[PDB]
Design a protein around this ligand. Sequence first.
Ligand code: NA
Length: 397
Amino acid sequence: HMIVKAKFVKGFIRDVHPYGCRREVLNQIDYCKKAIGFRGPKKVLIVGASSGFGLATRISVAFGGPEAHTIGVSYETGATDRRIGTAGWYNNIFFKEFAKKKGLVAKNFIEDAFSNETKDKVIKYIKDEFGKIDLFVYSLAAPRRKDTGNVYTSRIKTILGDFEGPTIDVERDEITLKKVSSASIEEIEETRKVMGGEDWQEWCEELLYEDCFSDKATTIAYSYIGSPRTYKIYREGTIGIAKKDLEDKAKLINEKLNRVIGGRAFVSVNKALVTKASAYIPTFPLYAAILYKVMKEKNIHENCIMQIERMFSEKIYSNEKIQFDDKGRLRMDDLELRKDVQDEVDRIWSNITPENFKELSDYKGYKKEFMNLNGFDLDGVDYSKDLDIELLRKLEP
Ligand code: NA
């Protein structure tokens, strides 16, 4: 029986507020329940289903109109003697509670998605109990990958020279300059192993050859391109190299699925959102804060769930044909990269100071979204209320 507070250690919040996480899940569900609605997917596999885009994907297909049954694969840990548990751990639990209330299947595999054991387990469940899958979304954003037993670690670096610029320190409400430098050859390769398209492709092949995909099944992975201002990181750097690998694999998966089941694969390039991993990378967080202000002013702002909802209802499962860019990618950053939006961001950038940034950018919204990632600062949650830790320990995914 304890009060959970937001304690910052080396820039990151230590604990998560589980009921704040519940509320965030519920806010996304609410958005989807009230949106125009779409139809299509019935049986959906999501690898990386516990947070961010994977979670929004799951909520969207379940509550956004299709009433899809879902399998979520994620590695998360619960409450112990000393730890409260990860946000994703709770997101899984609360998603399942709300999905079942609607009479939907919401299976969780709390498992390392990279291992052959996990694939076998998921495949067995599909063949035995779930039924064939019409949509497979790969949205794992793991920091490392275990293979023999080599461990590969993702890094966020340039391939040449320094990248430096402002980050947002949420704890002190200030801008702070940071720098990241060049990656080693091994670091580039490891990042490609973790973030590239290899595991996604393995999944698609196992699923395909084990007769787990429905005819005409779709599979999707997520990426980010952004503005030229951060190309050194997101296109040219270690992340950019991994994402090009992801894009290349999408093409090979697409060709195969098309030939074998009339299915398809593609990368959806999404918009800038606040995440833990991009906090403290130089120059992105300020970009995002300014972007939020501009797009909110222009009535075109989207958070994670809004991105996904529009992706599904307006582009993927719409009446009209799907439009890809010239490299076969679905572009959900079409509003972010709109000329008028980028012109305004660059203008504000040229006036922004460490002194005035809270007025020229959406620092408030940036900070709120950051806090929300650990279940803090959610409207309608009583943070003075103590939490029953033995009750939380009882919850099962
Ligand atoms: Na995800």
